[PDB]
Symmetry: C3
Subunit: 158 residues, 3 copies
Amino acid sequence: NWLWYIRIFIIIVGSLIGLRIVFAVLSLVNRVRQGYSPLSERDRDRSIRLVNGSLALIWDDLRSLSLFSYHRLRDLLLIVTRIVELLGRRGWEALKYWWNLLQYWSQELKNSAVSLLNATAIAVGEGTDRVIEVVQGASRAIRHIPRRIRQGLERILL
Amino acid sequence: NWLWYIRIFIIIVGSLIGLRIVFAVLSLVNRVRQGYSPLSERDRDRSIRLVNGSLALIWDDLRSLSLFSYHRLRDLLLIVTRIVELLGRRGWEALKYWWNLLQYWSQELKNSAVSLLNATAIAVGEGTDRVIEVVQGASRAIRHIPRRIRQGLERILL
Amino acid sequence: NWLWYIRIFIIIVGSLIGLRIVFAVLSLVNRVRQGYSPLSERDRDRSIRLVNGSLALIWDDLRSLSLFSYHRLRDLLLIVTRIVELLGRRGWEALKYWWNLLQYWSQELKNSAVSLLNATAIAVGEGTDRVIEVVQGASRAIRHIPRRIRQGLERILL
């Protein structure tokens, strides 16, 4: 019975995913070795030095983590909370992006609707253009709401 | 519980590969955090902004999506056909690369065979090497044509 | 049935991780799409030029793969193995770094331990500060920089 042998094989496939993490460096090699901006480098001989990166690897990881002024490394565990906390103050910009961004969207559809609907509204040609443009333009145009909302929302809490 | 509990255990183990996709985002951070060139940058404190990157995040993906205006977003639908139509016609240069590339080893192979065959060919007071050399030039050279399929195809594919 | 259809599904999940590699080419586009370092212009049509990359692939790959002079294409496979062997001797930088890596860790422990232990030691009138600094300082100071490990081992091991 090989099915059971195949059953654990199902689990091995899970192991395969962890294998992928090394591929991430291969992409970096590809990045330097294949150019820069879209494809539309002789150095690949040197890019093989990526393998040698194992020697170099203490430098990128320890530099921030422990940093030259040793004794700080125990202090760094406390700084990571501070780095997130310090930047999180500005993180509210989330509310910022949808109010401004969504606002422009209302604007282009407004232009498309006013053109098509106004044209169809004329029909007889008396004064339909007045009611169609004023009503649609009144709701979208007046819907304008300046920024500073996040500032007030943040200030009220702290 | 055992096999049934173990079966779902397989998909639970399978679940991580979707989690793994963030590593693609990590590679971006890696490029900056790894000193740019292969692993053979203090700014990671700055990379901490990536947590806050959510604020930045709706602008880069959407900018390409809607362009510098939601009116232009209407334009994106037209250019999308444009990019594919434009690149579909000139894109055939793919064949040109692989056509030349196939040809690349074909040249290396006959040249190597000539060195070995030409030298062993004489094996007496006779000009046997003249025979292996003439066959090399006539067969390889005549195996192709002066006409470029890349150019002819672009002019005959409308 | 059901479980069997679902059993092979894991095998599809294995395919799913293989699917993920394509993201690496996307990451190239994303690097450009992210402005520069993560996310914290009109060129989105230029990122589309990645599709044009099929024609481009001849230029990055041909020079690296076949090089300028011919007969190099077989040479590319041999040199790749050759640089690993050549650079392997230099690969020993693996150990020089771990020695320095653990060495600084001794440093954070040395100043941290002496500061706390020596501070509490003054409570005793005799000369405790002498024994506290001398013992900690003796192990780190004397062990600091023992000798050239990589030079001696690399020179003997070629």
